[PDB]
């Protein structure tokens, strides 16, 4: 039993280590990130989450990047500046992966890009997986 | 209501456009490929599918590349060479994706690469999605 | 402490069927098969000894 899982749960690159690709999520009703490390890290690497709105010139092209806001849960406290962020700990081994997702949608496009671009940033890869088709 | 889809259906990069990355399918019981274009194509691009055995000197590392053999279905015929291959046609638009997978597992690692490396191959991206885990 | 370190699962018992494509009035052909599986459970419930 092997399935064509790509039909129902497609995945798209979001950060290949040198460039960031906006990923459209309008046609799907869930999504989540997946982080992988290809080499041992030397320090913590934080990531920033953005989102885009449809461009005025063309409704099929994204606009400038906006920053996702924070949404506190019933336990815990809000972020210092109230904006979502992701931090990959130094303990991550080359042979393991991490996964996390945002509680809310906001715009129809999403993206992720590191706070700083350096030799330690190229040692990571990020991918986005959709889970449901509404069309 | 969002979900952490990255926990149940992790996705991994396979062909970012300039390099091929082995993907370990050992820990999961299904998988599949997803092809996406980022710029217009000029001619059909064929892809080769491989699999790797465990390396002799270290089980942590994949071995050499081996082609995946074909498995004919009930009412059908085998390929001319007997091996598995995938072809991305010309009509694919930049806003669409294609998904397909092999019927059998073979080795524990998997890989994919274009038959020839040129200006056309760099315009395609490949990602691997995997179903529930087993450990 | 087996019964928690490893599990064994069976799906159906062996079945035998006669094949109409190879059978004649002078011959017979039988087909058979079965299904089963197994998966490790807890990794902390066992140990292994080796020479060193």
């Amino acid at each position: 039993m092997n399935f064509n899982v790509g039909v129902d749960f497609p995945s798209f690159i979001a950060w290949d280590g040198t460039t960031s690709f906006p990923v459209k999520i309008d046609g799907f009703n869930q999504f989540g990130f997946t982080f992988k490390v290809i080499e041992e890290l030397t320090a913590d690497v934080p990531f920033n989450i953005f989102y885009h709105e449809a461009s005025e010139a063309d409704p099929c092209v994204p606009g400038p990047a906006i920053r996702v806001p924070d949404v506190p849960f019933c336990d815990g406290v809000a972020t210092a500046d109230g904006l979502a962020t992701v931090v990959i700990p130094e303990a991550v081994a080359v042979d393991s992966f991490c996964a996390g997702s945002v509680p809310c949608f906001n715009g129809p496009w999403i993206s992720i890009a590191p706070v700083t671009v350096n030799a330690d940033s190229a040692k990571v890869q990020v991918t986005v997986t959709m889970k449901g088709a509404t069309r | 209501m969002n979900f952490n889809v990255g926990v149940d259906f992790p996705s991994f990069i396979a062909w970012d456009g300039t390099t091929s990355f082995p993907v370990k399918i050992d820990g999961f019981n299904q998988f599949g490929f997803t092809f996406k274009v980022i710029e217009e194509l000029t001619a059909d691009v064929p892809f080769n599918i491989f699999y790797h055995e465990a390396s002799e000197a270290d089980p942590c590392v994949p071995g050499p590349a081996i082609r995946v053999p074909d498995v004919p279905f009930c009412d059908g015929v085998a390929t001319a060479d007997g091996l598995a291959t995938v072809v991305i046609p010309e009509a694919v638009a930049v806003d669409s994706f294609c998904a397909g997978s092999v019927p059998c597992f073979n080795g524990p690692w998997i890989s994919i690469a274009p038959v020839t490396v040129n200006a056309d191959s760099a315009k395609v991206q490949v990602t691997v999605t995997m179903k529930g885990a087993t450990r | 402490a087996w019964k928690t370190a490893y599990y064994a699962v069976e799906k159906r018992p062996m079945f035998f069927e006669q094949y109409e494509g190879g059978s004649s009035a002078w011959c017979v052909k039988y087909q058979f098969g079965a299904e089963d599986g197994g998966f490790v459970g807890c990794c902390e419930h066992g140990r292994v000894l080796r020479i060193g």
């Binding site: 990959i88 042979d95 393991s96 991490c98 996390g100 | 952490n4 942590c60 | 060193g52």
Partner: peptide, 27 residues
């Protein structure tokens, strides 16, 4: 804020951490 879920490794122990046994007690 996001809570990252991670798994130990792709392999249970890609290089299994075999360990010597406790040394013999005494004479």
């Amino acid at each position: 804020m996001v809570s990252l879920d991670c798994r130990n490794t792709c392999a249970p122990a890609p290089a299994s951490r075999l360990v010597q046994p406790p040394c013999f007690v005494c004479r």
